[PDB]
Amino acid sequence: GDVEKGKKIFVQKCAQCHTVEKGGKHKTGPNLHGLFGRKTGQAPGFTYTDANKNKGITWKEETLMEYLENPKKYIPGTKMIFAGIKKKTEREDLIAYLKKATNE
Ligand code: HEC
Ligand SMILES: [C-]#N
Structure with a gap:
């Protein structure tokens, strides 16, 4: 997937309550800062x-x-809240970005 698409998708529908950068404050969601390779929570x-x-x-x-x-x-009994990223593209695109973002 495309990191550029991914970055836009992140800005539009993740960045509100998360961060991938150093310094980026814990919001409602935790700072991902090296997500891939870590476990749930x-x-x-x-x-x-x-x-x-x-x-x-x-x-x-x-x-x-x-x-x-x-x-x-995946996790039986989360917060609700958006249904899911229905677009497989948007997912792959996003994930490709996050791969970058969390490494820099
Ligand atoms: C804020 C309004 C949220 C949005 C929008 C997104 N996430 Fe989030 N995320 C949020 C919370 C409160 C939690 C903790 C678990 C809970 O249900 O309370 C999470 C957790 C994750 C995780 C799991 C691992 C972790 O570090 O906690 C991932 C992998 C994750 N979130 C990814 C993610 C992505 C890629 C988003 C955009 C599509 C996204 N989140 C949006 C709150 C919110
Ligand atoms: C975050 N879901």
Whole structure:
């Protein structure tokens, strides 16, 4: 997927409550800062949920492709809230960006 598409998608529908940069304050979501290679609920600061911990996997790309499709299917009992990134493109594009962003 395209990191440029990905960056726009992130700005439009992730960046509100997350950060990938150093310094980028913990918001409603935790700072990803080196997400890929870590497990569900590692980022120190935000209070994780049982369910996220129950899930207990390592994040790569496939995992987000699947998670971003249905947070409830991956993690049974999340916050709600958007349905999911229905567009497989938007997911891949986004993930390709995040791969960059979290490494810089
Ligand atoms: C703020 C309004 C949110 C939006 C929009 C996005 N995320 Fe988020 N995310 C949010 C919270 C509160 C949590 C913690 C778990 C909970 O349900 O309370 C998360 C968690 C994640 C995780 C899991 C690992 C972690 O570090 O916590 C990932 C991989 C994640 N979020 C990715 C992500 C992406 C790529 C988003 C844009 C499509 C996105 N989130 C939006 C809150 C919010
Ligand atoms: C974040 N979902």
